Symmetry: C2
Subunit: 112 residues, 2 copies
């Protein structure tokens, strides 16, 4: 409950920090961490330029809400669900946030 919380925080932060180790091979982009433990919102974000195209946008965003990990955004090829389960997180404590609640009843994880 608080131990599940602390495990999920650890594991969410590890997974996101892992994915901080790479960045696009185009331009002058920095990849940054925005971790808010008070509200349990965890984001990694691209900020920079490709010449005079402004590059700006979350790559990956995971929330912890009611003892579950909500995947709010993933712009990568990675399967973050499968990477969370590979860290020993139960498939039913994972919500795909960018699926509608109806889509969620079908796509294999927790509806909420």
């Amino acid at each position: 409950g608080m131990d599940k919380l602390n495990e999920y925080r650890t594991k969410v932060r590890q997974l996101l920090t892992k994915h901080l180790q790479y960045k696009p091979s185009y331009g002058d982009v920095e990849v940054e961490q925005i971790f808010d433990e008070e509200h349990d919102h965890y984001q990694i974000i691209s900020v920079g330029w490709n010449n005079q195209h402004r590059i700006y946008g979350p790559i990956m965003h995971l929330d912890i809400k009611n003892n579950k990990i909500w995947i709010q955004q993933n712009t990568t090829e990675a399967d973050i669900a499968l990477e969370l389960m590979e860290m020993g997180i139960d498939k039913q404590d994972i919500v795909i946030g960018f699926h509608t609640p109806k889509m969620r009843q079908l796509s294999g994880f927790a509806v909420e």
Copy 2:
């Protein structure tokens, strides 16, 4: 230096918290805070739905870097620069992050 830091943190967090008080009149969108004091990255973000259109995206993002406030994103009508100055922040401690360095030499604020 550390007092400027703490003033800028206070004032950045106040301004962002202000803008948390409103949200789009379309859909089921939540507006959330992601404040990282370790790295001084401060974001407010839209997360939700407009029917089955996924709504996801930073509304407003301010960083504190080398004793200056970097406006990384603003999707609103607000002039955050002018709102920062209206809080007593000097125009030369404000960097418009979504302008190129060349654009910055022209648009009235600090280049870095």
